[PDB]
Amino acid sequence: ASDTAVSNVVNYSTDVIYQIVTDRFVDGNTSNNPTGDLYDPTHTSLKKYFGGDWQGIINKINDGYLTGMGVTAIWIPQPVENIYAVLPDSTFGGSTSYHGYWARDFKRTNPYFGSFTDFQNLINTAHAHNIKVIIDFAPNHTSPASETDPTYAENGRLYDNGTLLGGYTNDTNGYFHHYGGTDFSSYEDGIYRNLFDLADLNQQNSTIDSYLKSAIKVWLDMGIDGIRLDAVKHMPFGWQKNFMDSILSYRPVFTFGEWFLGTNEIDVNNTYFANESGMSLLDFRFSQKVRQVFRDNTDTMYGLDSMIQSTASDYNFINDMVTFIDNHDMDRFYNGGSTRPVEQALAFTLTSRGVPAIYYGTEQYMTGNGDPYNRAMMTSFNTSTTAYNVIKKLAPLRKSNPAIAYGTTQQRWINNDVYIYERKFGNNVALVAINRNLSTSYNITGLYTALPAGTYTDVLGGLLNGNSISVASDGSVTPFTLSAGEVAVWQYVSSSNSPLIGHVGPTMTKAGQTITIDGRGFGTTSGQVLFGSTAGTIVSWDDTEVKVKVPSVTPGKYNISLKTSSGATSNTYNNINILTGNQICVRFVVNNASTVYGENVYLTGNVAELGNWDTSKAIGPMFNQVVYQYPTWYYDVSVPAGTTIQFKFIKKNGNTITWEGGSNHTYTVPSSSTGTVIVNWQQ
Ligand SMILES: [Ca+2]
Ligand SMILES: [Ca+2]
């Protein structure tokens, strides 16, 4: 199977995701609809169940609507059993779990969406049509709760395949956090306190850790192809790395988290998370900039290029960034007036780096500013809209042109309103020109490209007013006019390729596991895959995909390269993280660690998971507000099971790092359960 096959579920760079709000798409089976106050058959009371279900999605796969658009993946809300209570809402009358965000049993289905058999039907129907299926999973919380009023909602009660674990009131087991609600005043505050009134799960509780691992395996066993993890800024990094290892050790699938970033927001924790957690991220830097430039007129094409360059610098796995122009929370991109801006934002996203996702109804110009106005029932299945056809024409290019799926991005021409950029992967090229100005044309002179000499037709066929270009042997493009609102796409796909790696997944692995290397020019005869300079055992070999067993190298990060059977060597794909063993979440706690202003406590130790004594990569800054208070510090850390570790704490700020004196602390990590290790700072 090639890199582009539906069964390659660790690489989504060749795909286009269609994000469906299940309840609000198609009611394919009325018999599974809720009854009473939960359900609104009129589809107008925007926090009720409207009846959209998995059979409905199946219908639109079978009838060609989604495939006719070039959709190759769907992303659906959490499939798990949700609460049945109808909650008061002064604006919408009643408020329900239609959205899937309010889990009561992570091991069972939401019966309104369907049974496990319906879910199976969805997976199988999608696969029969070369569509991958991503599910939301929201292990941060169960549902709205009041500890003092257990009659409110379902008191956040959690079940384990029908068996009650417990609720938020009288939580004698400590399944939930009891630290009030977050005001988002710090990263720490947002992790250990409740989001709104949602009962915050305590993942450090060994029963809950084991439960959530068991629960995601239920869905992996149902044949899901990907996971979108909700609220990843609101759970410990260490717990989530541990959670990711459980998934990837069982059956690896592409996983991406939601870590919201606002306009112009800078957060090094977001970069770290994407680079270290073992999962990818929804690309808010991309999305917010696209909105600024194409929708809201608060930045220019210069800002768009700056985002392209900055994100590529910061993120180790730029091809895994999940891009989008709107979603279930943002104001819908189409806001009235000309539809050209949304068409342009779609074209940009579909031809840019990463993994594009399109929110249902974007192709029908649906409007709606704010949750839940942005979640109206799907309005139309008209296949003649300009937006539908932009997607139809551009989506398949991610499969047919490896420059689009995997290539670098280079600015070739720019002014405030015009961006001409080039995607390049070996001798494969895509050149895209966009003029956002809806009233002014631009004369394009001095343009150069890596496209071979020749004349190139617009892949869009003039749908967005594109036209042909002529390219000379020196790469110079004959002057041309970019008309108002024009988008044009020109491409060259080479008939041959030197070995080129476009993607490796998963990025967090260990000895004996299998990783997938995708690209071009590997040849059909088996060669060699190198982890640094150490060969791995070949599982399978094809021109666009090699599967290889991870060798027993010293745990840490490795740069992957490939050598063909003739001896040709590929580029390196960097920073594949080889763990020491299966992961466990351990809470590290240090008492009596006093610091000066601007100084924080960090953890360092003698395994890769603790940075192998590298103070510049020490774990932290540690926390000291919620679970324990300064000068006690704590942090939840993913560490190798059953391993006897040595560690110390350090204090750093910018002047001179202070280490604990004395001998190293030592601790043997549990074999399967979460653990806590508490020590006193050593002078
Ligand atoms: Ca239904
Ligand atoms: Ca939390």
XYZ file of C-alpha atoms and ligand atoms in Angstrom:
685
model
C 0.000 0.000 0.000
C 1.128 3.528 -0.861
C 1.474 6.560 1.424
C -1.910 7.740 0.128
C -3.878 4.611 1.086
C -6.826 4.855 3.508
C -5.142 2.247 5.739
C -2.117 4.511 6.383
C -3.488 6.057 9.552
C -0.307 7.653 10.946
C -0.018 10.174 8.075
C -2.794 12.632 7.199
C -0.704 15.090 5.126
C -2.160 13.690 1.872
C -5.724 13.979 3.230
C -8.463 16.579 3.507
C -10.563 16.344 6.666
C -14.234 17.310 6.794
C -15.292 18.221 10.331
C -18.855 17.116 11.016
C -21.029 18.095 13.971
C -22.936 14.809 14.033
C -26.196 16.053 15.557
C -26.318 18.909 13.054
C -25.485 17.077 9.817
C -28.064 14.447 8.717
C -30.747 12.625 10.702
C -30.362 9.256 8.924
C -32.506 7.388 11.436
C -35.462 8.974 13.206
C -36.035 5.954 15.469
C -32.854 6.762 17.409
C -33.876 10.385 18.084
C -34.290 11.475 21.704
C -37.808 12.070 23.009
C -39.173 14.926 25.118
C -37.257 18.096 25.954
C -33.940 16.683 24.678
C -35.089 16.773 21.060
C -36.153 19.593 18.732
C -37.609 18.300 15.427
C -37.851 21.887 14.094
C -34.037 22.233 14.167
C -34.244 25.789 15.559
C -33.517 25.617 19.329
C -29.769 25.567 19.038
C -28.708 23.636 22.158
C -31.151 20.706 21.706
C -30.575 17.444 19.852
C -31.670 17.907 16.229
C -31.290 14.173 15.514
C -28.220 14.051 13.248
C -26.544 10.664 13.506
C -23.979 8.202 12.150
C -26.441 6.719 9.650
C -26.818 10.278 8.307
C -23.073 10.540 7.679
C -23.135 7.070 6.110
C -25.820 8.328 3.702
C -23.653 11.219 2.520
C -20.678 8.900 2.027
C -22.722 6.367 0.042
C -24.459 9.013 -2.113
C -21.261 10.697 -3.284
C -21.624 14.103 -1.627
C -18.405 13.884 0.378
C -16.379 11.885 -2.158
C -17.547 14.240 -4.937
C -15.793 17.012 -3.016
C -12.510 15.098 -2.589
C -12.991 14.625 1.168
C -10.714 11.770 2.339
C -11.267 11.955 6.092
C -14.069 12.878 8.475
C -13.751 14.196 12.011
C -16.755 13.626 14.276
C -17.529 14.664 17.871
C -17.023 12.364 20.830
C -18.923 9.110 20.123
C -19.264 8.137 23.795
C -22.391 8.012 25.952
C -23.303 11.532 27.104
C -25.602 12.808 29.877
C -29.364 12.816 29.325
C -30.224 15.798 31.517
C -31.661 18.966 29.988
C -29.989 21.926 31.701
C -31.428 25.434 32.137
C -30.287 28.121 29.703
C -31.761 31.644 29.905
C -31.138 32.291 26.188
C -31.881 28.968 24.456
C -34.436 27.517 26.899
C -32.681 24.208 27.507
C -29.131 22.935 27.003
C -28.234 19.336 26.081
C -25.326 17.002 25.301
C -26.074 17.166 21.521
C -22.418 18.233 21.040
C -20.937 15.068 22.606
C -18.722 16.985 25.094
C -20.455 15.768 28.255
C -19.386 12.139 28.726
C -20.983 9.742 31.178
C -19.413 6.496 29.890
C -16.304 6.541 27.674
C -16.787 2.823 26.890
C -20.280 3.011 25.397
C -21.870 4.910 22.513
C -24.157 7.899 22.573
C -27.303 5.969 21.552
C -28.686 9.035 19.770
C -25.741 8.960 17.362
C -26.024 5.164 17.152
C -25.030 1.754 18.533
C -21.598 0.143 18.246
C -23.001 -1.582 15.145
C -23.873 1.826 13.622
C -20.386 2.999 14.536
C -18.940 -0.088 12.860
C -21.084 0.693 9.805
C -19.679 4.233 9.730
C -16.062 3.029 9.950
C -16.633 0.399 7.253
C -18.592 2.668 4.888
C -15.926 5.366 5.194
C -13.138 2.857 4.505
C -14.956 1.391 1.487
C -14.824 4.935 0.061
C -11.216 5.693 1.065
C -12.293 7.965 3.925
C -10.480 7.877 7.280
C -12.436 8.462 10.501
C -11.208 10.684 13.332
C -13.092 10.849 16.655
C -13.033 13.537 19.324
C -12.042 12.258 22.745
C -12.434 14.445 25.826
C -10.683 12.882 28.852
C -10.463 16.228 30.690
C -13.937 15.989 32.202
C -17.285 14.272 32.371
C -20.171 16.751 32.544
C -21.587 19.834 34.337
C -21.697 19.388 38.117
C -22.223 21.141 41.416
C -20.586 19.491 44.427
C -22.952 21.247 46.855
C -26.032 20.492 44.712
C -25.825 16.844 43.534
C -29.305 17.126 41.964
C -27.876 19.438 39.284
C -27.496 17.672 35.924
C -26.101 14.170 36.526
C -23.552 15.387 39.116
C -20.748 14.562 36.635
C -21.307 10.843 37.238
C -18.937 8.486 35.428
C -19.690 4.890 34.431
C -17.321 2.108 33.359
C -19.320 0.181 30.735
C -22.497 0.567 32.826
C -20.871 0.241 36.264
C -21.003 3.445 38.315
C -17.545 4.650 39.302
C -18.739 7.795 41.073
C -19.932 11.385 40.875
C -18.617 14.819 41.829
C -20.360 14.895 45.217
C -19.017 12.439 47.829
C -16.041 11.674 45.601
C -14.387 9.495 48.252
C -12.213 7.806 45.610
C -10.756 11.111 44.361
C -11.783 10.507 40.739
C -12.220 14.266 40.246
C -10.453 17.501 41.204
C -12.029 19.620 43.937
C -10.196 22.894 43.444
C -13.092 25.009 42.168
C -13.174 26.491 38.669
C -10.315 27.873 36.601
C -9.993 31.584 35.881
C -7.250 30.723 33.359
C -4.823 32.820 35.455
C -1.990 30.339 34.780
C -1.193 27.127 32.872
C -1.327 25.353 36.252
C -4.648 26.919 37.247
C -6.211 25.727 33.974
C -5.059 22.126 34.427
C -6.107 21.301 38.009
C -9.320 23.350 38.308
C -12.642 22.854 36.482
C -13.364 24.199 33.012
C -16.609 26.080 33.653
C -18.687 23.661 35.791
C -17.410 20.502 34.071
C -16.306 17.904 36.627
C -12.525 17.806 36.143
C -11.218 14.250 35.922
C -8.250 13.354 38.091
C -6.035 11.479 35.613
C -3.395 10.989 38.319
C -5.820 8.653 40.085
C -4.649 5.181 39.042
C -8.195 3.931 38.419
C -8.933 6.907 36.144
C -5.601 6.613 34.271
C -6.266 2.898 33.680
C -9.911 3.573 32.793
C -9.097 6.178 30.149
C -6.409 3.946 28.610
C -8.890 1.047 28.539
C -11.584 3.325 27.059
C -9.547 4.651 24.123
C -8.609 1.027 23.337
C -12.340 0.279 22.975
C -12.456 2.840 20.159
C -9.167 1.721 18.618
C -10.701 -1.767 18.510
C -13.709 -0.299 16.665
C -11.274 0.673 13.897
C -10.903 4.445 14.276
C -8.182 6.047 12.166
C -7.430 9.073 14.308
C -8.134 10.953 17.517
C -8.696 14.640 18.195
C -7.945 15.241 21.871
C -10.011 17.967 23.502
C -8.671 20.577 25.943
C -5.004 19.543 25.890
C -3.929 22.781 27.607
C -6.121 21.662 30.544
C -4.524 18.301 31.322
C -0.941 17.709 32.439
C 1.562 17.355 29.605
C 3.106 14.378 31.426
C -0.194 12.576 31.766
C -0.946 13.094 28.068
C 2.484 11.889 26.909
C 1.829 8.780 29.033
C -1.650 8.494 27.488
C -0.225 8.859 23.978
C 2.284 6.099 24.598
C -0.564 3.777 25.622
C -2.354 4.523 22.329
C 0.744 4.270 20.127
C 1.952 1.043 21.782
C -1.443 -0.553 21.155
C -2.230 0.586 17.606
C -0.803 3.915 16.453
C -3.162 6.438 14.862
C -2.723 10.103 13.954
C -3.657 12.143 17.024
C -3.977 15.907 17.317
C -4.889 18.115 20.263
C -6.802 21.350 20.616
C -4.712 24.040 22.299
C -6.473 27.316 21.562
C -4.386 30.329 20.588
C -5.852 33.767 20.029
C -4.849 36.364 17.478
C -1.118 37.155 17.833
C -0.821 34.842 20.861
C 2.643 33.568 21.755
C 2.990 30.473 23.927
C 6.140 28.363 24.201
C 4.106 25.696 26.028
C 2.109 25.168 22.809
C 5.319 24.654 20.798
C 6.700 22.276 23.436
C 3.435 20.309 23.502
C 3.400 19.803 19.724
C 7.083 18.811 19.725
C 7.143 16.492 22.739
C 3.725 15.012 23.559
C 3.586 12.387 20.813
C 0.558 14.110 19.279
C 0.156 16.961 16.801
C -1.886 20.152 17.210
C -4.678 22.078 15.575
C -2.784 24.959 13.995
C -4.277 28.091 15.605
C -1.350 30.267 14.508
C -2.215 29.347 10.902
C -5.980 29.654 11.379
C -5.903 32.964 13.225
C -3.538 34.543 10.690
C -5.650 33.331 7.746
C -8.671 34.954 9.379
C -6.746 38.214 9.988
C -5.589 38.377 6.388
C -8.584 37.089 4.407
C -11.598 37.727 6.676
C -11.115 40.494 9.218
C -8.542 42.750 7.522
C -6.141 43.039 10.469
C -2.942 41.832 8.816
C -1.456 41.749 5.314
C 0.141 39.028 3.170
C 3.445 39.901 4.877
C 1.937 38.640 8.143
C 0.737 35.506 6.377
C 4.245 34.718 5.108
C 5.719 35.543 8.522
C 3.377 32.956 10.064
C 4.379 30.370 7.431
C 8.087 30.895 8.170
C 7.719 31.154 11.971
C 5.545 28.056 12.364
C 7.921 26.049 10.140
C 10.808 27.138 12.377
C 9.070 26.420 15.701
C 7.303 23.124 15.000
C 9.402 19.995 14.481
C 6.614 18.297 12.523
C 5.142 21.058 10.371
C 3.511 18.527 8.021
C 1.379 17.275 10.936
C -0.105 20.697 11.808
C -3.887 20.493 11.407
C -4.989 23.651 9.587
C -8.472 25.172 9.276
C -10.202 28.505 8.697
C -13.018 28.032 11.230
C -14.534 25.341 13.470
C -17.259 24.528 16.016
C -16.232 27.449 18.260
C -15.139 30.242 15.914
C -17.421 32.599 14.015
C -18.125 30.986 10.651
C -15.684 32.271 8.055
C -18.377 33.439 5.660
C -19.805 36.565 7.250
C -21.818 38.120 4.424
C -20.746 39.985 1.292
C -18.472 38.434 -1.344
C -17.818 34.703 -1.149
C -14.364 35.184 -2.697
C -12.538 35.609 0.646
C -13.725 32.206 1.951
C -12.935 30.603 -1.422
C -9.426 32.062 -1.189
C -8.956 30.937 2.417
C -10.027 27.429 1.375
C -7.632 27.423 -1.597
C -4.782 28.663 0.574
C -5.422 26.035 3.232
C -5.830 23.200 0.712
C -2.486 23.979 -0.977
C -0.503 24.835 2.175
C 1.539 22.638 4.511
C 0.018 20.355 7.139
C -3.312 18.563 7.323
C -6.289 20.643 6.141
C -9.663 20.426 7.899
C -12.871 21.991 6.560
C -15.815 22.680 8.898
C -19.105 21.212 7.564
C -21.150 23.716 5.585
C -18.244 25.994 4.687
C -18.813 24.781 1.127
C -22.452 25.981 1.371
C -21.557 29.444 2.733
C -23.243 28.780 6.081
C -23.127 31.717 8.500
C -23.188 31.878 12.280
C -21.194 33.930 14.730
C -20.590 32.101 18.010
C -21.448 28.777 19.628
C -24.175 27.613 18.973
C -25.120 29.839 15.975
C -22.188 28.280 14.101
C -23.780 24.828 14.502
C -26.979 25.160 12.489
C -28.373 22.103 10.707
C -26.520 21.532 7.419
C -28.358 23.814 4.989
C -27.829 22.256 1.568
C -26.018 19.579 -0.420
C -25.701 21.708 -3.558
C -22.667 20.401 -5.441
C -22.514 23.379 -7.829
C -21.276 26.065 -5.405
C -17.936 27.687 -6.185
C -16.565 26.607 -2.777
C -17.597 22.940 -3.286
C -15.720 22.945 -6.579
C -12.638 24.701 -5.183
C -12.397 21.787 -2.735
C -13.136 19.227 -5.480
C -10.301 20.568 -7.644
C -7.666 21.113 -4.952
C -8.217 18.352 -2.376
C -6.976 15.523 -4.669
C -3.694 17.392 -5.241
C -2.583 16.346 -1.750
C -2.625 12.735 -3.044
C -1.335 13.387 -6.576
C 1.327 16.029 -5.861
C 3.822 15.266 -3.062
C 4.981 18.921 -3.065
C 1.582 19.838 -1.630
C 1.481 16.983 0.899
C 5.093 17.239 2.078
C 6.941 20.143 0.490
C 8.692 23.169 1.919
C 7.088 26.596 1.473
C 8.913 29.506 -0.145
C 7.720 33.068 -0.775
C 8.191 33.862 -4.476
C 6.285 37.169 -4.730
C 4.658 39.399 -2.116
C 2.971 42.716 -1.440
C 0.212 43.717 1.004
C -2.478 41.974 -1.064
C -0.575 39.343 -3.073
C 1.105 36.135 -1.965
C 2.750 33.851 -4.492
C 4.253 30.858 -2.721
C 5.938 27.668 -3.841
C 5.598 24.163 -2.433
C 8.613 22.007 -3.293
C 9.487 18.355 -2.691
C 12.472 17.317 -4.804
C 11.529 18.163 -8.387
C 7.812 18.203 -7.550
C 6.469 21.742 -7.462
C 3.264 23.658 -6.833
C 3.136 27.411 -7.344
C 0.134 29.296 -5.954
C -0.790 32.936 -6.555
C -3.445 34.744 -4.509
C -4.627 38.356 -4.771
C -6.921 39.127 -1.815
C -7.866 42.572 -3.153
C -11.366 42.402 -4.633
C -11.116 45.657 -6.605
C -7.459 45.987 -7.655
C -5.287 43.981 -10.066
C -1.501 43.627 -9.847
C 1.209 43.405 -12.506
C 3.468 40.476 -11.588
C 7.060 41.024 -12.720
C 10.353 39.538 -11.521
C 8.720 36.260 -10.457
C 10.904 33.130 -10.361
C 9.911 29.491 -9.810
C 11.350 25.972 -9.665
C 8.726 24.852 -12.216
C 10.527 23.479 -15.300
C 10.427 25.554 -18.478
C 7.015 25.449 -20.145
C 3.466 26.771 -20.109
C 1.261 25.896 -17.122
C -2.515 25.876 -16.929
C -4.422 26.847 -13.781
C -5.409 23.651 -11.920
C -8.585 25.499 -10.877
C -9.457 25.946 -14.577
C -10.239 29.629 -14.034
C -12.790 28.875 -11.299
C -11.238 31.637 -9.183
C -10.248 33.716 -12.242
C -6.897 31.936 -12.618
C -4.984 31.838 -15.893
C -1.875 30.291 -17.461
C 1.778 31.224 -17.011
C 4.948 30.712 -19.053
C 8.222 29.775 -17.367
C 11.735 30.037 -18.858
C 14.686 27.681 -18.295
C 16.143 30.101 -15.721
C 12.866 29.974 -13.759
C 11.699 33.443 -14.776
C 7.943 33.773 -15.231
C 6.672 35.949 -18.084
C 4.913 39.050 -16.665
C 1.190 38.486 -16.084
C -1.807 40.175 -14.489
C -3.192 38.887 -11.226
C -6.806 40.106 -11.413
C -8.941 41.197 -8.466
C -9.619 38.210 -6.199
C -7.633 35.840 -8.440
C -6.311 32.481 -7.248
C -4.220 30.382 -9.646
C -2.447 27.081 -9.015
C 0.314 25.737 -11.279
C 2.116 22.442 -10.780
C 4.721 19.967 -11.946
C 4.881 16.364 -10.757
C 8.129 14.615 -11.698
C 8.151 11.231 -13.441
C 11.101 10.122 -11.299
C 12.371 10.883 -7.806
C 15.563 10.576 -5.817
C 14.765 9.169 -2.349
C 12.825 11.814 -0.397
C 11.162 11.449 3.015
C 8.049 13.595 3.396
C 6.682 12.144 6.637
C 7.430 9.772 9.512
C 4.746 8.590 11.932
C 4.333 8.081 14.793
C 6.977 10.502 16.076
C 7.105 8.943 19.558
C 8.061 5.291 19.602
C 10.386 2.704 21.170
C 12.507 -0.332 20.308
C 10.552 -3.057 18.517
C 7.648 -0.845 17.462
C 7.004 -0.084 13.777
C 7.254 3.376 12.218
C 6.026 4.389 8.769
C 8.235 6.410 6.423
C 6.406 8.096 3.544
C 7.710 9.996 0.532
C 8.936 9.232 -2.986
C 11.798 7.508 -4.784
C 12.511 4.740 -2.275
C 12.498 2.134 -5.053
C 10.710 -1.219 -5.048
C 13.677 -3.266 -3.805
C 14.380 -3.165 -0.061
C 17.233 -0.968 1.114
C 18.065 0.438 4.531
C 16.466 2.761 7.089
C 18.838 4.474 9.512
C 18.082 5.827 12.968
C 21.036 8.176 13.086
C 23.603 5.652 11.838
C 21.875 2.505 13.137
C 19.855 0.330 10.749
C 16.337 -0.799 11.650
C 14.708 -4.049 10.519
C 12.612 -3.600 7.367
C 8.978 -4.683 7.713
C 7.873 -3.670 4.197
C 9.313 -1.632 1.336
C 7.649 0.298 -1.505
C 8.556 3.422 -3.544
C 6.388 5.745 -1.445
C 6.311 3.902 1.903
C 8.649 1.874 4.090
C 7.705 0.305 7.420
C 10.595 -0.404 9.784
C 11.106 -1.838 13.269
C 12.789 0.554 15.697
C 16.278 -0.723 16.712
C 17.592 -0.831 20.300
C 19.406 2.507 20.220
C 20.040 4.624 23.321
C 16.692 6.296 24.084
C 16.469 9.868 22.805
C 15.758 11.724 19.570
C 16.924 10.386 16.223
C 17.130 11.670 12.673
C 15.743 9.182 10.160
C 17.250 8.618 6.745
C 16.731 6.055 4.023
C 19.144 4.392 1.599
C 17.844 2.761 -1.579
C 19.110 -0.665 -2.672
C 21.438 1.136 -5.113
C 22.917 3.262 -2.315
C 21.153 6.604 -2.865
C 20.556 8.420 0.443
C 17.457 10.458 1.269
C 17.093 13.671 3.228
C 16.862 13.292 6.994
C 13.575 13.562 8.855
C 14.534 14.817 12.294
C 13.530 14.439 15.930
C 11.854 11.029 16.099
C 11.661 10.316 19.832
C 12.659 6.859 21.035
C 11.444 6.249 24.589
C 13.116 4.127 27.272
C 10.069 1.880 27.738
C 6.302 1.945 28.138
C 5.246 5.121 29.931
C 3.761 5.775 33.384
C 2.589 9.104 34.801
C 4.480 9.941 38.001
C 3.829 12.998 40.139
C 7.192 14.361 41.339
C 6.986 16.496 44.491
C 9.807 18.423 46.191
C 9.460 20.141 49.579
C 11.374 23.120 50.990
C 12.618 24.474 47.661
C 12.803 28.248 48.244
C 13.482 30.487 45.244
C 14.290 34.108 44.461
C 12.183 36.344 42.199
C 12.137 34.989 38.622
C 13.592 31.646 39.678
C 11.769 28.323 39.376
C 12.326 24.684 40.294
C 12.864 22.077 37.563
C 13.393 18.306 37.494
C 16.350 16.548 35.878
C 17.414 12.900 35.846
C 19.159 9.963 34.268
C 16.666 8.827 31.620
C 15.706 10.420 28.296
C 12.248 11.184 29.697
C 13.937 13.470 32.253
C 16.415 14.927 29.755
C 19.465 12.843 30.731
C 20.822 15.527 33.088
C 20.547 18.250 30.416
C 19.629 21.331 32.468
C 18.555 23.244 29.346
C 15.838 20.596 28.862
C 14.971 20.118 32.544
C 11.310 19.403 33.265
C 9.366 22.526 34.277
C 9.054 25.217 35.475
C 7.297 23.127 38.094
C 3.935 23.967 39.649
C 3.333 25.277 43.173
C -0.216 26.634 43.578
C -3.009 24.069 43.389
C -2.157 20.509 44.495
C 0.707 21.719 46.700
C 1.808 25.229 47.643
C 5.204 26.945 47.418
C 7.865 26.161 48.614
C 6.578 22.702 47.723
C 6.676 22.186 43.950
C 5.160 19.415 41.850
C 4.794 18.178 38.279
C 3.246 15.197 36.527
C 5.817 13.503 34.311
C 5.793 10.633 31.822
C 8.545 8.159 32.769
C 9.483 4.577 31.779
C 7.659 1.766 33.626
C 9.568 -0.353 36.135
C 12.722 1.723 35.716
C 14.874 2.762 38.663
C 15.598 6.423 38.002
C 18.036 8.859 39.600
C 17.028 12.507 39.771
C 17.613 15.912 41.297
C 15.866 19.248 41.352
C 17.456 22.462 40.177
C 16.639 26.150 40.485
C 17.073 28.390 37.450
C 16.240 31.911 36.374
C 19.039 33.298 34.166
C 22.011 33.838 36.504
C 23.550 30.564 37.745
C 21.684 27.235 38.056
C 21.500 25.862 41.614
C 21.427 22.079 42.043
C 20.466 20.006 45.039
C 23.529 18.892 46.965
C 24.010 15.374 48.325
C 23.352 12.124 46.478
C 20.753 11.741 43.742
C 17.197 10.904 44.730
C 16.168 7.469 43.463
C 12.786 5.936 42.661
C 11.538 2.866 40.839
C 8.658 3.762 38.529
C 5.534 1.566 38.929
C 4.996 -1.231 36.403
C 1.489 -0.177 35.305
C -0.216 2.259 37.699
C 0.349 5.971 38.245
C 2.700 6.862 41.097
C 3.782 9.736 43.329
C 7.294 10.349 44.650
C 7.818 13.026 47.310
C 11.256 14.204 48.430
C 12.817 17.058 50.389
C 15.170 19.537 48.728
C 18.774 18.637 49.563
C 21.186 21.483 50.335
Ca -31.454 10.363 14.457
Ca -8.123 19.263 33.914
